[model samples]
Target chain A: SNTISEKIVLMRKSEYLSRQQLADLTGVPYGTLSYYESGRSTPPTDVMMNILQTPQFTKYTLWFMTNQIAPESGQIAPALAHFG
Target chain B: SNTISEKIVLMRKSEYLSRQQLADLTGVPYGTLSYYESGRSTPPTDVMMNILQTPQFTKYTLWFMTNQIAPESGQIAPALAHFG
Candidate 1:
């Protein structure tokens, strides 16, 4: 479920946050968030970015962006050690 | 500095990869890559996702998504420890 909609729903629900709460946190309208969740329309770049960058959602930044889980060492982006 | 254009250029140049090379790697056309690099047009979400999904650029996924650096301990998303 790398699709944005699934990730959006998963992230919100995993936090036990309601859609309205997620909308309120991201400053997006509830209808818009519902539309995104229901896949009627995909979120645009800025909107998705706004949602992902919310403090409560930041932990999923790498996973959502790249679809890779953090490894056992907890380094989400391993290349950062070599290049960043 | 968190702007997409700046990050694109910084990532490419930091890797010493030319625009043509990056375009080739990401399957993005050179003109489009040039446009993005020059800030004439921004890469949309899908295009940027393609670029970041390229293995060489994956290290910056969290940074690009959230404008936060991987902390010194190399934990890009610390909350993963508690939640993920």
Candidate 2:
């Protein structure tokens, strides 16, 4: 919950999308998205995959899922190296 | 859609639990479970992982997510081997 929630928040920030907009794009409800961001709940794998594979995050999908991306560069869209 | 749908059907049959029961255990809606089983929707990775991690399915998590299980024996649990 914590790690993924943190990553989702950082990813949303880098993409400049508000919660409502994020919901529109990801097909997740606004309240649900908020819960996901706040670590109150976790997004299902398919939802996470859908969100991460969006054009705004295509670069990070595999990298994020692999969990190989380091926290030092975890500010999202730091454009860090390689996807496993 | 097709692959996962097929797999879920196989898994569910092997376990002898109804879709409602499956949803209750996995925290996904029964409607969503039907959709997933039908390949109309995909269960997000987290939900699927949660389901797979249940005592009923812990053995198949990695194999399922990794897509390493073969259709020949994909009838859910024939008790295959190895993760990673």
Candidate 3:
């Protein structure tokens, strides 16, 4: 599925926000964010929510964490729809 | 890491209700309910779909908005969880 592909897209966007920035917004420690981003750790459900709720973070988090589009985003772009 | 303490522990467990019951139940203005719940907001994306999908807010909103919970004998807790 394109799920992982979408997540990578979100993660790349989140690259714009610093780890410290995400920490401040999510009230999570800079270390935790680093751990997750560096692929050193997996966040629990609660932590996942915090990351998802943070502005600009959700898009990427959903892609990486859930490996799914936000439910409202609907079907996969190429899978369900074709546009040029 | 602790990771936000599990979304307030399901926010004290939803009272429980069926989907149609959720639709009929109302407290927060219903007009915005589907809009926010279904994910058709600013940026032309369904924001709440992401928020509500997570365990914490998903449980809380069921109570706060839909009030679909059966009101089984229980107390409303502080609604706070550890933000690890």
Highest-scoring model, DockQ? 1
Name model 3 segments beyond 4 Å from true: A1-15, A59-84, B1-84
Cα lDDT tens digits for candidate 2, B1-84: 226676677666667778988888877789988998888887665566556655665544323444333233221332322222
TM-score of 1: 0.76
**Candidate 3 residue-wise lDDT, A9-81, digit = tens:** 3443435655576688789888766766565655544455555555454433333332333334321222221
Worst 10 residues of 3 chain B by lDDT: B1-10
lDDT of 3 at B77: 25
TM-score of chain A, all candidates: 0.79, 0.72, 0.56
Better of 2 and 3 by TM-score: 2
Ranking by lDDT: 1, 2, 3
Error of 3 at A80 (Å): 20
Give the runs in model 1 whose Cα sits over 4 Å from its true position.
Answer: A71-84, B71-84
Candidate 1: tens digits of C-alpha lDDT, residues B2-65 = 4666667777876678898998899999998888877788665667778888887887677667
Best by lDDT: 1
B6-61 per-residue lDDT for model 3 (tens digits): 22223322424333443344332344444433434221122333344444344333
Report the CA-based lDDT of candidate 2 relative to the real structure.
0.59
lDDT winner between candidates 2 and 3? 2
DockQ of 2: 0.15
For all predictions in the order shown, the interface RMSD in Å is: 2.9, 9.2, 13.2
All models: lDDT? 0.70, 0.59, 0.39
Give model 3's DockQ, 2 decimals. 0.05
